[PDB]
Symmetry: D2
Subunit: 387 residues, 4 copies
């Protein structure tokens, strides 16, 4: 079996004009040979292109690379992770349907599900998905979808994807998994029973902090077609230049993820033993509740996780005296990022959800990059040891 | 008194690092000076950026440009015209609401309004908006929006935006106008009483056929904030490179439109007097129904219009023996495009709606570019003789 | 007219794409050893490596080639790359070059500092007078190099007459037509052997690319230019070639407006009490207007005018609200510059005085803004 | 000391408008605050920009990154490696000067030294620089420069850079080293006594096969200013978009080089023991003449090297039956490339030099990428074992 490293460096498809790098198709439209050839293409007959919103070759190349690592029937690229999320939910859910989603999600996902979905007649419950019994108890005759992020952003809370998939499969609901925090190198939700696996490509997949994009991959040709049907009318598109950048970033994904994983674990162990640190929420630590599930269902760990300081003032002093780590939101970049969830990424999450997400002013989230790990640790140590 | 040409060439804003051209901010995220500065930005306090989905300086520069020409409170850029349309309607409409839309729309707009909105519990009636009394008859107690394209894609049917706007003001509904076909140089819906004016930037505004993008502009600060709030969660973004290209394309918009207008008018009159053409639907032709409303409510015409051949075989013969004109969907590019609506742009629209639209296999849609008009006329002339 | 040709360039579409794709690649794949071997020998159609040939760059080359009436065109990383490749590709130790006495600053630097280190004799002379060219002639003269109208004074040379001397005496005529664009000046049509532009200016026209292009009358000459380029390495990036081809789609239309704006602004300045003199080739008062009207089909919109003092020039340049103080020219928006202390600051004083550049001169590059807005901007800054 | 990985991820300089990624300054010109402020910049007084040919912020950012790894006084970026070579030689050499260069060089470098320099009255001798005594024997009172590639493209012939530097330093000649084949992670010519270190950035530094570019770094402020002065008139510029891509590719250079080095050595050892293979020219092999100099003067190896088949026909059979390796010129890409020097990269080298260079139709050059090394070896092995 050929390694993922090789597969990503050797994607299927013909070269264009013998070009070694896949060209950037910075075009809106495509030319027809004849009236029939164009008419046929609109009916889905024959091979070729019409218009970049419907399909663009550079973007299609990136989709195939994601499709190849997910083990999907197809993938669809979007202008952002939120585009991928919207199109993976609202492509299926309609007025009268019920959605069960995790109670700890990325802020804008909470916004989508709690503000917009109810305006469209869609019933939503945010449930603690780390407990399958609670998922079952929240199930209704009109439940059509379960949506999970695991490990959750930012607390790393682990859900049992495999166990929840069984219930979805017995009861006719789609299981959708946002695997952004871990990357398709370490978490393949379609192998665990999910119907759709999505990512903010803005994070690890692209990895270079210079594009915003989303991707969604479906187990079934019918589901990926419906997703693309929705995309056509909702209009969240990956730009050709951004697809070129994302495919390029993804060429180094496996080796970056190996370094991220090892760095993140070493940084978490350093913090876990440090006097100033109260707790570390990294799912690769044995102290972490849900570690046994993460270890079974994933083949590695991302490097973004959260830790607890003794006070808000101590969190502030740390985050503001770092020379290698950069104070900024986002994650999964080659360089190390740090932020304060309570006042930043999750300052917009309703208080009812803040308290049961478990997010407090003492928490700091770090996204460990691929810098030499000793340099990252020395940077944290010097700020922790300040006068 | 400063001319539109000058305004687009001299946008408001500081230069970045003294750079003459506005830099391409190809970044996802922005750095914070301190915990407080970041927390302040998340609360809308102070000046600065956080993350490109919330706001990107290169994108914002293009948004300001469009906002200037529309006379808007603010503008929002998107990944596509369909992103602008989705975000300008579903940002406001919710379950139990009712939408009145023109019956002749771009194909994917029909798919949006006919397939997705009713799945979200939104009631939708497609009606002939060229007659204001028909809009009034279709009105219900829960009508929250009227959505228009004028001149319509592809038949160029004209609606009285100004009169429909009065009805909307009186009865508590938003008026949303898709002005893609005409461009903001010639049609300014917000000056006519609309609440929202939107464009597929993919067409005239960019004008170079190398970008897909959308833009929407709102009369009020509250409405554009709502649109951007929807965009934050729906995620149709204009990429920084595409915003760089759209702004650059828009620098020549006024001169390009002037040529497009004059070129398209001349080509339509050539066709209108040719023996093989049954009729030409150009809103600037005296013969066109609705010409009188278009000359009053617009300050010029786009150059995309349709004309009728005697049969499908004739249309097929014309479209396939052109040497300058390119057989392709889309419009508003620098070069001339030509298309068969029945089996291309409007192939997926249900028979029911399509016959209401008056779209038949005998119609050909041309998008006249900025070539020497004589080369376009001679191309058509050559082909019409075979 | 020219617009149709630029919008419909020859060649096949790639994957049916309407816009020509950006080949952001260094290398190309071979079907077999033989096919690679053949390509390196110039046999068969195809590509090897972007420095030898990139499809996106070649499409832009083809566009310029068509408008110039050339055997071929080569694109470069800057106008200076085009200039140095159109000269040092041909000149060698022992050769003599005659160049116009008034040239862009870096061209003077190239001809004055570098060429003589390579053993190439160079004299700068007044090429507005053909007898001076004949008098500077030597038995080893292999090239005459010209800018017309010259940067920044707009000094006009008789290109056709000089070409005649060159053809008779066995020298190449190379012409930098940056200031006018190939819409209005076609040197190869006037007898010149090579015609070149800084694409950074009018051709691209959007102020967001630096690039150069050179076009030769003969297949041999362009092949030599590209062979030099292969080793010297001033290439146009695929992205910049995409942007230049895109900018060039509006070239004939932008030029029409530049020309008209520039002529209206120049006449306004010419009759303004505060202005000593205006150096625009299209004015009747300008010396050599007759040659420029004969040999060109229009004018660019960059020209020089004289103020009554340095303090007055500084006051004008620093109270403008539309015009931007910046070097460069041929952008869609208006630019203004002080030659003596900016573009031409490094020029040796003796070449400087022979050029006629003083601290009282201001150089304007008139954009495509509404003319009345440009004039009203100049008006308030001169009067207030 | 902070690690190179960390340095490259954390370059000196302020952020622009708080942007995390450095913006692409796709501009030709820059604005002046006043006549004086503009005048001053032209005189080298004050901080700021004039015009991209003179300096572009995105390009300067990439230059700073190279400068930091080379340990130089400054770096200059170009539109190609050939731009860097032309500008690092012809910026200093004039009519009457003598240049000693290696006899095994990149083909277009031979073309430059052999066709263009003599036309400019510069005397040139190509010498076997693997023998310091041959360098001394070729020295003349007017020798001003020695120019070396080591390991040479394509034969990997090693020169004693340290030993030749001694001679240059005693006699008033600049030593210039093209370190393209090894990358600045493993070869730092300025630490060995060179005056100038240059690269085709097209190869390893950028690493993604999608940019052509060059860079030159000088030990002395004066020499880098002279290089940039030449560049300003000769006009080989790195485009802003290309500088953005090179800086981005360079963010992963140390980890890519680590994998290239290990992959290349394992592939070389596999070929060395294979019955079909006559000889393997990889400088990290103990069998290689000059291995001892290479291991003392470098801190690793690039992964581009050459091997000898039994015949031209066997070389063609191998090259044309690979599924992972790609038949193309260039090198230093994330994916594996392969080519035939005799009929491709060195087919323009005049017959006397190509004889002295030791290039025969039996030689194949491989540029080993970062694919899984077992997948690369299996691809070579299957082609070598064909019917
Ligand atoms: C291929 C597209 C065509 N039109 C598009 C279009 C859109 C949709 O805009 P994006 O395509 O999403 O940028 C919105 N509004 C109008 C009046 C339109 O014509 C076409 O007809 O040929
Ligand atoms: C800042 C630059 C100015 N000029 C440039 C120029 C070049 C050189 O072109 P690159 O700059 O190398 O593309 C060549 N030829 C002419 C007549 C030029 O004006 C300027 O004057 O303001
Ligand atoms: C003359 S082909 C140039 C490509 C590259 N320098 C190589 O050796 O492969």
């Amino acid at each position: 079996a050929q390694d993922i490293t090789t597969t990503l460096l050797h994607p299927k498809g013909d070269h264009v004009l013998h070009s070694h790098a896949y060209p950037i198709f910075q075009t809106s439209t495509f030319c027809f040979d004849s009236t029939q050839q164009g008419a046929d293409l609109f009916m889905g007959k024959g091979e070729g292109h019409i218009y970049s919103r419907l399909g663009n070759p550079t973007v299609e190349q990136f989709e195939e690379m994601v499709c190849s690592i997910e083990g999907a029937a197809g993938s669809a690229a979007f202008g952002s992770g939120m585009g991928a999320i919207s199109s993976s939910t609202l492509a299926f859910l309609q007025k009268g349907d019920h959605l069960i989603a995790g109670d700890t999600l990325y802020g804008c996902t909470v916004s989508l599900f709690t503000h917009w979905l109810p305006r469209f007649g869609i019933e939503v419950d945010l449930i603690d998905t780390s407990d399958v019994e609670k998922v079952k108890a929240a199930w209704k005759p009109n439940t059509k979808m379960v949506y999970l992020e695991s490990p959750a952003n930012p607390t790393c809370k682990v859900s049992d994807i495999k166990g929840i998939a069984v219930v979805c499969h017995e009861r006719g609901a789609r299981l959708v998994v946002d695997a952004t925090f871990t990357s398709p190198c370490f978490l393949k939700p379609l192998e665990l029973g999910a119907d759709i696996a999505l990512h903010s490509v803005s994070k690890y997949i692209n990895g270079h902090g210079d594009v915003i994009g989303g991707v969604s991959s479906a187990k079934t040709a019918e589901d990926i077609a419906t997703i693309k049907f929705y995309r056509k009318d909702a209009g969240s598109l990956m730009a050709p230049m951004d697809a070129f950048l994302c495919a390029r970033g993804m060429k180094t994904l496996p080796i970056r993820m190996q370094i991220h994983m090892e760095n993140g674990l070493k940084v978490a162990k350093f913090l876990e033993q440090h006097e100033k640190i109260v707790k570390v929420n990294h799912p690769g630590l044995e102290s972490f509740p849900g570690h046994d599930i993460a270890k079974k269902q994933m083949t590695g760990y991302g490097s973004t996780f959260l830790f607890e300081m003794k006070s808000f003032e101590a969190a502030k002093k740390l985050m503001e005296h770092l020379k290698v780590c950069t104070l900024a939101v986002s994650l999964g970049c080659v360089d190390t990022l740090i932020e304060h969830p309570a006042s930043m990424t999750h300052a917009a999450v309703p208080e009812n959800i803040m308290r049961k997400q478990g997010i407090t002013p003492e928490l700091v989230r770090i996204s460990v990059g691929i810098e030499n790990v000793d340099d990252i640790i020395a940077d944290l140590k010097q700020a922790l040891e300040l006068w």
